[PDB]
Structure formats: C-alpha cells, structure tokens
Symmetry: C3
Subunit: 306 residues, 3 copies
C-alpha cells in the first residue's frame, strides 16, 4: 500500500489539534478549530490504519522488508505514535476509548523498540549511512508521546519514565547524527527527513510541560532555546532541503512544528516569552497550513498515492 | 594471576549488600541479609586484593600490558571501585577504617583516570574497535562510586562534583559506544561486557539519591526511565549475548543489577512507583543469585581460576 | 592582517575583568584590578577590531577563505564574543553603549552560526579531520556569552534560551570530539587549541550563575565536577600539548581559566566549596598572568604579529 511515512499526515494534524485544544480557555473559539483538526486527523488515521491492515494481509513481504531495514523500520513507529495522539484527541469525548488507544500505542511502541532498536546493537546490518533523522521516531518521539498520553490519563510518574527514556535517547543519538550530516551529504531523496531534526527539543518540552502541569521552568526554557537554534539552522538549510522540489515528505517537519505550537500555548499561559510564543504558534500554523494546501493540490493531481 | 575482571564479583556482592542495608528500617531482617552479603563481599575483596598484590610483585609485565592497553586498562578501575564499596559496607561497624578505604579508592580512581583516560586523547593508540562498554568503569562508575561514598562520610558538595563528572562523562561516551555497537558486531569473547551497558542510568540514580538524601525527584524518575529502556533492550539481546555459552563474564551485569536494587529501595521509601520498585528489587536479586549459583558451580568444576 | 585567533587575548582579559568585578563587595580592591584588566582588554579589542576592519577592506579573500573553511571559520566567532564581553565591562560605566555592543555581538553570533554552522550539515566539506575543539567557539561559547550578557541587561528568559542552545550544543558536539581525539593524534600545530576543551563546563556554569542570580545549586555543582575532571586531564596532557614549544596559541586556555575564576566567585559568595573556590581563582589568575608575561615577551622580541 500506502507508504508508511504517510502516517506523518495524521500525526501532524493530530498534534496541531492538541495544541489548539490547550488554548480553549484563553480563546474559546480555539476549541472548534481543535475539534475540526482532531476529527480530520482521526478520519485520516482510520483510513490509513485500514490501508496498513490491508498491506499486512496482502503485501506482507513489503512490511517485512521495511521492518528489517536498518533505516526504513523507523517509520513504522508512526503507527503507534498516531494511535496515541488520536487517543489524546478522543479523550475529550470518550476517556475509555482514549485510554484503550493510548495503551495500545504505548505497549506497541515499547515492544517495537525493544525488538528492533536493540537488535541493531548486534552489529553488521546498520551502517554509517543508516544514520538518518528518522531514527528519532522509534527512539525519541514514541517515548515522548507515551509520556504525555500517560500523563493525560493521570499516570504522571510512569509518564516521567517514558519521558526520561526519550530525552536521554535523544541526547545519545543526536551527536552521531549531526556528525554524520556534516561529513556525508544526505541524498535528495531523503532530505525532507531533515525536518525531523526540528522535532526533538520541541516534542521534549511539550511532553515535559504535559507531565509537569504546565510549569514553565528552567529546563523548559533551555529546551526552547536549543529548539529555536535548530529551527533557524533548518530555515537556512531549507532551499538545500528542497533542492529537487517540494514534496509530500515535507510532512516530516509537522512533528516539530506542531510541538512548537503546543509548547507555545504553555509558555503563553505561564507568561514566559509571550511574544515569542505568539510568533511560534502563528508560524507553525502557517507552515502546517501550507503542508495541507500542497497536499490537497497533490491529491487534486492524482500524485498522492503511489 | 586472577583476571582483573574478577573484581566484578565482590563489586556486585558489595553493591547488593548496600541495597539490602537501605531496607533495614522497613524490614528489619534485611540487615542480616545485608551483613551476610557484605561479609562475603569483603572476604572475597581481601582475597582478590592479596592476589593482585602478588600479580604486581611477580607478574608485573602482565599488569603493565593491561594498563597500557586502550581496552583492558578499564578493568583496573574495578579495584578502587570495590575498595570504596567495601569501605561503605564497613562504615556500619567502623567509620574510621571505612573512611580510609573510601579516600584510598577515591584518590586512586581519580589518579588512574587522570593518568590513563586523558592519555587516550593523544591519539593513535585507541582505535574505533577499542570502543567498548568497559570504558564506563574508569570514566563513569568510578566517579559515581566516589560520589556516594563521599556523601556517606558527609561530604555532599564534594560528592556532587564527582557525581557531575560521572554523569556528564556518561552522556559524552555513550553516543559513540551505541553507534559503534550498531555498526560493528562485538565479538563473542567480549559480549558479556554488554552487561555494563545496563549500569549507567542505575548507578547514576543510585549515587544521586545517596547524595540528595533520597529525594525521588524529576531527575531520578528520568534516569529510571532510560535505565529500564536499556534493561528491556538487554533482555531482548540476552540470547545473542550468550550465543557462545554462559560464562563468568556475566558478572558484568551485576553493577547495573545491584544499582537497580539500591535505587528501588529509595523509590519505595519515597512512595514512587512502588510496584515497579518491588519488581526491580526482586528481579535484580534473582539474577545476582543466579550469578552466584553459576559461580559456585564453576568453582566446583575447577573452572573458576585461570 | 592579524591572525583571527588573536581575539582570544582580549577575550581572556575581558572575561578575567568580569571575574574580579564580581569580588568587589567581598574585597573592595578587586574593583581596581577589574577596572585595569577591563580597560586593557577594551583597548586591545579596539585595536584588533580596527585591524580586522582593515583585513576586511584590503585582504578580503583571506577572510573569505577562513569563513568557508570547515575548521578555520570558528575563530571568527571570537569577534562577537569579545564584543559582548567588552559590552559587559562597559556596562559599569555606560549601560547604553554596553547594550549596543551586547546586541551587536548577539545578533552577529546568531547570524554567523545560522549561516555557517548549519551549512556544514549539507555534507562533503567538513571531514572527520575537521573535528576540532575550535568548533566550540561558534557553537557553544558564543551562546553562553549572549546568555550572560542578556541577563546583565535584565533579559533573563531570553538569556535562558541562549543558555540552553549553548548547553545542549555542547553535549551534542563533545562526544564526537573526544572520540576523534582518542583515535586521531591532533597535529602539533593545532594542539594548543586543546585548551578550548577546558572551557565548556566552566563557561556553562558561569553563564548559568549569571542568569540564575548566583544560586549555586545542583546543576552548578555538577558542571564544576566535570569541569575539574577536564582540568586534571588537560594538566596531565600539558607536556604533550606543548611538545613543540610554548606559543601564543595557549591563549586558547584563557576562556576556560577566566570562567573558572568567575564561577569561583559565585561558589565563594554562596559558601559552597570555598577552599576549592580560592584555589580555582588563584590558579586561573596565575595561569592567565603567565600568558600575559609570555605575550609581553613575544612582543618584546617582535614575534607577536605575523
Ligand atoms: C508492524 C509489524 C511489523 C512486523 C514485521 C515482522 C517481521 C517478521 O520477521 C520474520 O518472521 C517470519 C515469520 O512470520 C520468519 O519466518 C522470519 O525469520 C522473520 O524474518
Ligand atoms: C507497532 C507494533 C510492532 C510490533 C511488531 C513485532 C514484530 C517483530 O517480530 C519479531 O521480530 C524479530 C526481529 O526483530 C524477528 O525475529 C521476527 O520477525 C519476530 O520474531
Ligand atoms: C542536556 C540537557 C540539559 C539539562 C538541563 C537541566 C536543568 C535543570 O535546572 C534546574 O531547574 C529547576 C527549575 O527551574 C531549578 O530550580 C534548578 O535550580 C535548576 O537547576
Ligand atoms: C500560544 C500563543 C498564542 C496565544 C494568542 C494570544 C493573542 C492575543 O494578543 C494579545 O491579547 C492580549 C490580551 O488577551 C493583549 O493584551 C495583548 O496585547 C495581545 O498581544
Ligand atoms: C594498577 C597499577 C598499574 C600501573 C602500571 C604501570 C605502567 C608503567 O609504565 C611503565 O613504567 C616503567 C617503569 O616502572 C617505564 O619503564 C615505562 O616507560 C612505562 O611503560
Ligand atoms: C588504581 C591505582 C592506579 C594508579 C597507578 C598509576 C600508574 C601509572 O604510571 C604512570 O603512567 C604513565 C602513563 O599513563 C606512564 O608514564 C608510566 O607507566 C607512569 O608514568
Ligand atoms: C541528559 C540528562 C537529562 C537531565 C534532566 C534534568 C531534569 C531536571 O528537572 C528539574 O527537577 C526539579 C526537581 O524535581 C524540578 O523542580 C524542576 O522543576 C525540574 O525541571
Ligand atoms: C525496594 C523494593 C522492596 C520493598 C519491599 C516491599 C514488600 C512489601 O509488600 C507490601 O507490604 C505493604 C506494607 O508493608 C503492603 O501494604 C503491600 O500491599 C505490600 O505490597
Ligand atoms: C566576518 C565576515 C565573514 C564573511 C565572509 C563572506 C564570505 C562570502 O562568500 C562569498 O560572497 C561572495 C560575494 O561577495 C560570493 O561571490 C561568493 O559566492 C561567496 O563565496
Ligand atoms: C560575525 C558576523 C558574521 C556575519 C557574516 C555573514 C557572512 C556570510 O555571507 C553569506 O554566507 C554564505 C554561506 O554561509 C554565502 O552564501 C555567502 O558568502 C553569503 O551569502
Ligand atoms: C548532561 C547534563 C546534566 C544535567 C543535570 C541536571 C540536574 C538537575 O537537578 C535538579 O536541581 C535542583 C536544584 O538544586 C534540585 O532541586 C533538583 O531536585 C535537582 O534534580
Ligand atoms: C572566589 C575565590 C576568591 C575569594 C577570596 C577569599 C580569600 C579570603 O580568605 C579567607 O578570609 C576569610 C574572611 O574574609 C577568613 O575567615 C578565611 O579563613 C580566609 O580563608
């Protein structure tokens, strides 16, 4: 079927729904915006889940190949990540169904990493050229997503465990990723995944603020600072990133963008850097809006599905 | 003599004695268990120290070779680490003798790293293939051990310095270690040392809780989360680790296991994740119990000493 | 002109002026010492700025080459760093002019890194052999300097953003730097830059204490611990560092030394490790004093300028 990376679309939309949700008491109309984005993300997730179920049943060898690949395996983590985010959305309407989805996605991502990420340490399969930003998905983003989802359900201390796993995994991987990028020019076909480099600090602070009841403290400010540094670097790099043209892979940026938006709501609520917060929230919405527009355009030309 | 790595045996036993010690007021019988493990660890340490003194006097070129090796040097750090842990045990009976051992081990480990770990930065001796988990011993575990031992003696601020040295050294080394493991299959003869990968987060949180008066805070929960992630990964990898058979090298795991047990006592005392704490404490005791049983078995067959 | 690295001289002197400044209320005579060092640093900075302006106008291709070099570009960051430090000095006399310099240096360093540090991620220019301690200048030291300068002006939350950018950039680069040093013997002509390895933890804690109102907390103690570990390692390595002779490049050490001095004033004020603080402050002053003496000597022999 469907390329596994397309789960980035409901991921980005779902995460953006949750960001707007957190503005509802400052600005009541934010709830309708959140509900609309959340319904659209959920519908797209349902479709993509059904399509992936079909892939498993009738194209299993494609799934097997992607699973055993030391690079492509990572995109599978998008499935449980999006499952948890849809759970977080649904919590506003039905906490029971939300909790089921959150546990399925949590157990699923932990099983996934435990099976596949650890296996890499056997050596001889992963190569230096396998050192791609997509590795953040199973290693980092999945753990932060479990952290914030478990906090939503009231399991704050368990959430902190998943939080720590993601934060330390991030700091442990990024050094070798950035060195690899410096030495080796990432080929155009993979370059859109540079957008995932935006994610770690913003997804980290978003998850942190979810678990710590929105307390904007020293750690949060530290994370925002490195997050904005990476944003500036990626903005400068953008023309290089899209050297060979705009493409649907640019949804890679939506994880970081939506988390910039979510964290910005908490900085704003805490009266920390409110002007920066407004900029971050507007910027991220405009960019995801542009992703949506370019996606509708592609669907319009029959250039969406493979 | 005696392979230097055999100091891992009294290390694991001593650390486990200290874990049980910290349960004595919740469960008084824990003290007898702690005292027994502590006496056995101390007796084994005495024997191994005397044997290593004999190695220094009559097999000095073997010591010299191990010292100058960019891989084997690390195991020497087990000597001052175990010396400090025996000091921590003895403190319950004789604080004066305890303090002497703790300072000997602290000054010894710091001198050792200052001489040998820094020397590696001259280049040309350490190679990519030298990137082994054993490096954590002089670089990380030795500093955490000094931190907690100095805290025991009431030198908390000095303990925090050693703590920071170990924590930042850990985060600075692990990125390149895990990348190396991914690319290069660690040969079977070294694979038991994968057990040292369990140690950092647990030894870190154990030392931290020792210095901060057992306050189970955000940092502690973060460390436990990454610690359990690594545990799960190593459990999945275990059949690969022991591909060529069970061996005495598996005492490599005891450092992390004993620190899981120790930290679990503090999480339990703090009423944080008590169910996880009970599991961690029981699991680690069972695994170290299995190490002891397999060791008695080897001694029984005359397959212990070289 | 003038080698760009010579900006390390007013950098080291300016930073040391700020350290003495922070003793003025414990020891009033410290103010005169601070004022003298600050005037000398400012005068040297003025001279070097004018000389670099001349280089830009009449030797532009030399500047272009250094800018595009994946190793030599880093020294350019010394210009905005020193500009901010001179601003911090001048603040005691004229806060308006100080603020102008601080914003010029902040915007300048951020623009510099955004343009050049990010560009490295395109690959194919930076090589493994490009992995030099000088990279800390644009990546780490510049951000910490902005953090503390902005805090001086009362912009603490913005300062925390720059702080986080520098701290996380540090932890992200150092792993690959130390692995490179282990494997590859850094050639003598670059070895004096090993002194920059002293800087990160001390510049970090100095900036942190500037933003957090001098509160010597757990993070501060942790940073000092790793800072002293690196000091000990570099002391052991010093004879290797200067294998081919003493040279003006040794001003590389002044960044870390001056930050040891500055942070020591805050530990002393906070009654934390006062004995260590006194040692650190005296040691760093003696070493920078020796740099000054060797520099006067070189100027005396006409061996200073190229
Ligand atoms: C999201 C789900 C991804 C799962 C991919 C599973 C990869 C399976 O792996 C395969 O399992 C087979 C049995 O069915 C074995 O024959 C093979 O040895 C093994 O390659
Ligand atoms: C998102 C949900 C993911 C869980 C899917 C589990 C599929 C793994 O399946 C297992 O993986 C092993 C290697 O890692 C292989 O031995 C086999 O394919 C199988 O044992
Ligand atoms: C590589 C990752 C960087 C980690 C930075 C951790 C910073 C922790 O910082 C701590 O936060 C508390 C709340 O504001 C403060 O009260 C403490 O005094 C402060 O040190
Ligand atoms: C998380 C970032 C998005 C938050 C949106 C805030 C936009 C509101 O804008 C603000 O409204 C204030 C009062 O409500 C006015 O006082 C401010 O001047 C104005 O900037
Ligand atoms: C635990 C103790 C380990 C110490 C190992 C010391 C390594 C000594 O090193 C050697 O010292 C000799 C002198 O005795 C010199 O001749 C040699 O140059 C040097 O290799
Ligand atoms: C656990 C106690 C350890 C301290 C032992 C110190 C032995 C080091 O000895 C020194 O090491 C140098 C290289 O690193 C060599 O020059 C020589 O062997 C010697 O100078
Ligand atoms: C790479 C290493 C990860 C470091 C994580 C540091 C987390 C510090 O976290 C801090 O702990 C305090 C105590 O609970 C809190 O009050 C602070 O608000 C919290 O930020
Ligand atoms: C550090 C982990 C080991 C701690 C051992 C705890 C085992 C005790 O077990 C517990 O006893 C409680 C009261 O004492 C009972 O109320 C609990 O239900 C029970 O789980
Ligand atoms: C501190 C200031 C450093 C700036 C160095 C600038 C490097 C300029 O770069 C050059 O700019 C030229 C135009 O002037 C172009 O022709 C070139 O493509 C480009 O190499
Ligand atoms: C300390 C103040 C530094 C700011 C100087 C900016 C000089 C950069 O100039 C730019 O750099 C690009 C590559 O990175 C090149 O395209 C060109 O030289 C130019 O566009
Ligand atoms: C790789 C970088 C290491 C980061 C270490 C972060 C330590 C944060 O530590 C926090 O500091 C506060 C102030 O003292 C305390 O109250 C917290 O309880 C303590 O955890
Ligand atoms: C930051 C490190 C430099 C601080 C300099 C301190 C030197 C003063 O020295 C100290 O003076 C005290 C009272 O003023 C005496 O009581 C102490 O015994 C003495 O050590």
């Amino acid at each position: 079927p469907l390329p596994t990376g397309y789960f980035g679309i409901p991921l980005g939309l779902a995460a953006l729904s949750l960001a707007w949700f957190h503005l509802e008491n400052l600005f009541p109309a934010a709830r309708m915006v959140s509900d609309v984005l959340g319904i659209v993300a959920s519908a797209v997730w349902i479709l993509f889940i059904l399509m992936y179920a079909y892939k498993l049943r009738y194209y299993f060898e494609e799934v097997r190949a992607e699973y055993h690949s030391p690079v492509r395996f990572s995109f599978i983590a998008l499935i449980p990540i999006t499952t948890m985010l849809v759970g977080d959305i649904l919590y506003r309407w039905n906490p029971l169904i939300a909790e089921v989805l959150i546990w399925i996605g949590t157990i699923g991502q932990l099983l996934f990493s435990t099976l596949r990420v650890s296996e890499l340490w056997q050596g001889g399969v992963f190569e230096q050229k396998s050192t791609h930003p997509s590795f953040y998905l199973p290693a980092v983003a999945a753990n932060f997503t479990s952290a914030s989802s478990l906090a939503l359900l009231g399991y704050h201390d368990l959430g902190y465990l998943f939080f720590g796993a993601g934060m330390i995994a991030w700091i442990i991987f990024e050094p070798v990723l950035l060195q690899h990028l410096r030495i080796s020019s990432l080929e155009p076909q993979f370059r859109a995944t540079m957008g995932i480099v935006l994610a770690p600090a913003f997804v980290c602070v978003s998850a942190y603020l979810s678990i710590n009841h929105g307390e904007v403290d020293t750690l949060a400010k530290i994370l925002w600072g490195y997050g904005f540094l990476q944003l500036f670097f990626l903005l400068r790099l953008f023309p290089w990133i899209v050297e060979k043209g705009l493409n649907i892979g640019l949804w890679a940026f939506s994880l970081g963008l939506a988390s910039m938006a979510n964290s910005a709501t908490a900085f704003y609520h805490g009266n920390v850097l409110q002007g920066v917060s407004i900029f971050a929230f507007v910027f991220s919405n405009v960019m995801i809006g542009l992703l949506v527009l370019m996606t509708i355009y592609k669907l319009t030309k029959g250039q969406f599905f493979l």
